[PDB]
Write an enzyme that holds these catalytic residues in place. Structure first.
Site, PDB file in Angstrom:
ATOM      1  N   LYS A  85       0.698  -1.283  -0.110  1.00 30.15           N
ATOM      2  CA  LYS A  85      -0.112  -0.041   0.146  1.00 30.15           C
ATOM      3  C   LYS A  85       0.725   1.270   0.210  1.00 30.15           C
ATOM      4  CE  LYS A  85      -4.371  -1.387  -0.301  1.00 30.15           C
ATOM      5  NZ  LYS A  85      -4.186  -2.847   0.182  1.00 30.15           N
TER       6      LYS A  85
ATOM      7  N   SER B 159      -3.136 -12.790   2.720  1.00 34.81           N
ATOM      8  CA  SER B 159      -3.445 -12.576   1.517  1.00 34.81           C
ATOM      9  C   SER B 159      -2.541 -13.268   0.636  1.00 34.81           C
ATOM     10  CB  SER B 159      -3.767 -11.123   1.018  1.00 34.81           C
ATOM     11  OG  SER B 159      -2.440 -10.379   1.381  1.00 34.81           O
TER      12      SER B 159
HETATM   13  C1  LIG Z   1      -4.437  -3.821  -0.474  1.00 33.56           C
HETATM   14  C2  LIG Z   1      -3.948  -5.357  -0.242  1.00 33.56           C
HETATM   15  C3  LIG Z   1      -4.082  -6.210  -1.206  1.00 33.56           C
HETATM   16  C4  LIG Z   1      -4.680  -5.966  -2.654  1.00 33.56           C
HETATM   17  O1  LIG Z   1      -4.085  -5.164  -3.477  1.00 33.56           O
HETATM   18  P1  LIG Z   1      -4.989  -4.177  -4.312  1.00 33.56           P
HETATM   19  O2  LIG Z   1      -4.019  -3.339  -5.206  1.00 33.56           O
HETATM   20  O3  LIG Z   1      -5.712  -3.253  -3.642  1.00 33.56           O
HETATM   21  O4  LIG Z   1      -5.870  -4.894  -5.454  1.00 33.56           O
HETATM   22  C5  LIG Z   1      -3.759  -7.624  -0.950  1.00 33.56           C
HETATM   23  N1  LIG Z   1      -3.506  -7.901   0.471  1.00 33.56           N
HETATM   24  C6  LIG Z   1      -3.377  -7.029   1.372  1.00 33.56           C
HETATM   25  C7  LIG Z   1      -2.703  -7.522   2.662  1.00 33.56           C
HETATM   26  C8  LIG Z   1      -3.364  -5.692   1.033  1.00 33.56           C
HETATM   27  O5  LIG Z   1      -3.117  -4.831   2.008  1.00 33.56           O
HETATM   28  C1  LIG Z   2     -10.328  -5.608  -0.395  1.00 34.74           C
HETATM   29  C2  LIG Z   2     -10.136  -4.759   0.762  1.00 34.74           C
HETATM   30  O1  LIG Z   2     -10.514  -5.259   1.845  1.00 34.74           O
HETATM   31  C3  LIG Z   2      -8.932  -3.889   0.822  1.00 34.74           C
HETATM   32  C4  LIG Z   2      -8.725  -3.200   2.049  1.00 34.74           C
HETATM   33  C5  LIG Z   2      -7.760  -2.095   1.498  1.00 34.74           C
HETATM   34  C6  LIG Z   2      -7.155  -1.313   2.878  1.00 34.74           C
HETATM   35  O2  LIG Z   2      -7.964  -0.437   3.131  1.00 34.74           O
HETATM   36  O3  LIG Z   2      -6.003  -1.789   3.248  1.00 34.74           O
END
Ligand SMILES: *Cc1c(COP(=O)(O)O)cnc(C)c1O
Ligand SMILES: CC(=O)CCCC(=O)O
Ligand SMILES: *Cc1c(COP(=O)(O)O)cnc(C)c1O
Ligand SMILES: CC(=O)CCCC(=O)O
Lengths: 302, 302
Positions: free
Chosen positions: A40, A263
């Protein structure tokens, strides 16, 4: 150079134990190695930088930035906000870990808790109000083209260059949709035959036709199709179950020395399956959004 | 590329808010951005790699490795042992954070908790006792020259290269002494006037003449002069108090977006005292051993 300058240029590693003999090569980009601990950092910086470019934000002004987020985005923004002299306010459900709040507060971010019952909705509602009252800038991570732009200009190029353009498939667990769209477009332009495969929680398989639902893959599987996600890019969607992914994340830590996030477990699990499909002589690339540090309280590592 | 190959090549930022106008430039290398989250990744890999090179360990053998450590060294070793298939055992005071135990066990390390009241004294004895009954290999981070070699071969070159060879003073809070010695020699072989200044807790100023004592700068200040520390390189020693370093650590996160660790607070503080003595134009470089993440439940960020 300021902290933002240290964003990106993350390394990529090739799995060697969790893979199988007839699998394509599997490479993982470690975004957990960014200054803010996650992928992020990129979007955070780009959405603010873009805001500055358009004259909406003036550095060191103390201007207000507000965004409803209970994940890495809040952290990325707090880090950037602290560096460029902005006043950050994040809205979120009160169920927020008495752990994640500390890090956000460490960067001087202001946290506004909201009805844990209304959840995401309440958080957004409050953020919108604050936006109006304070005339603040709101990133709006799911609709902000600058989110995509960050991966189109940095993440994509980095992955393509580090892998010498030898990429047959790109796999990613979509959240805001920015990474897969950004990297996706970049790779497509140069490797037109490249397969872009999205990954989503089986328990919230909206991309597969299913319906929203609770799932443990924090960061991805928002429960809807965000504006930032360009469907035309996708060549397939893989549904992942916590039952398969978490154990894999454990093998990754234990056998590869790769301590990744929730994730990541699902994404790599997906990459592995795509690798079996493609076979030898092919290379599958995926991305690890963040490390496993912030999930030590989840059953994945307890 | 394996995880151990993704170690190093960390960025270096320049402070812009916490410095004064009459100060020399202050640059900070962020070692918290290594795979294992700290500067220890380097010595961890080198000591293990060196052992393999000498034929003491064969990868994937499951050979037992033991080491007394309640800090980052245990984490770096855990990551490496996991990557190269070695059975790691770590000894440490029973106090230890529960999350900290979870990260080590996530890498598959085995923990042996010793007498809290006798600190590292008890852990050291328990680690030696194990090395003796199991015939295990012991890195011995305070005496192992490979620790030093890691910084003399990577950290130093990286810093010198990143700062265009323009460095007037290098400041570092010695722990095992490997970093200041490794980087020190490297710089003092290419910069005839560079001043290498060691930093230590005022409350355990062994290098200054005082006796060892309890202090809160986790990672540095062993309370003794370790073999790895080459005193002949030193051109001075600055004592630091937590009452000074911690407030600054807070300022760094909130004003520079640099969420660093406890030792980083003391190191950076000492760096500013040097930056002021040298005056504008001059360049001072120091290293941030790790990030703030692991210290959110300490009086530094709680
Ligand atoms: C932001 C995020 C994602 C997904 O990526 P996007 O660019 O928002 O599609 C997946 N896993 C985690 C832990 C994230 O913070
Ligand atoms: C698909 C999500 O839950 C994204 C959360 C992104 C965020 O706020 O870090
Ligand atoms: C290891 C460490 C140090 C000191 O570095 P040495 O290379 O051991 O001299 C300082 N702070 C932290 C947090 C560390 O882990
Ligand atoms: C001098 C030290 O306290 C060193 C701690 C190194 C370790 O993390 O084991």
């Amino acid at each position: 150079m300021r902290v933002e300058g240290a964003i990106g240029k993350t390394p990529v590693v090739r799995l060697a134990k969790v893979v199988e003999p007839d699998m394509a090569e599997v490479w993982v980009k470690l975004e957990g190695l960014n200054p803010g601990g996650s992928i992020k950092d990129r979007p955070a910086w780009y959405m603010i930088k873009d805001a500055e470019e358009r004259g909406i934000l003036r550095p060191g002004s103390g201007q207000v930035i507000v965004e409803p987020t209970s994940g890495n985005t809040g952290i990325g923004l707090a880090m950037i906000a602290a560096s460029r002299g902005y006043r950050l306010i994040l809205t979120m459900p009160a169920q927020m870990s008495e752990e994640r709040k500390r890090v956000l507060k460490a960067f001087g971010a202001e946290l506004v808790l909201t009805d844990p019952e209304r959840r995401m909705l309440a958080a957004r509602e409050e953020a919108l109000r604050l936006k109006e009252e304070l005339g603040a800038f709101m990133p709006d991570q799911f609709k902000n083209p600058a989110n995509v732009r960050a991966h189109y200009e940095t993440t994509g190029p980095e992955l393509y260059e580090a892998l010498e353009g030898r990429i047959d498939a790109f796999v990613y667990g979509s959240g805001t949709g920015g990474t897969i769209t950004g990297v996706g477009r970049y790779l497509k332009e140069r490797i037109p035959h490249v397969k872009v495969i999205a990954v989503e929680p089986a328990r919230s398989n909206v991309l597969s036709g299913g319906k929203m639902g609770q799932h443990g893959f924090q960061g991805m599987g928002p429960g809807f199709i965000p504006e930032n996600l360009d469907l035309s890019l996708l060549d397939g969607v893989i549904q992942v179950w916590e039952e398969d992914a978490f154990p894999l994340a454990r093998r990754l830590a234990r056998e590869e020395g790769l301590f990744l996030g929730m994730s990541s477990g699902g994404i790599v699990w997906a990459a592995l399956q795509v690798a079996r499909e493609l076979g030898p002589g092919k290379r599958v690339a995926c991305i690890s959004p963040d490390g496993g540090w912030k999930y030590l309280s989840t059953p994945l590592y307890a």
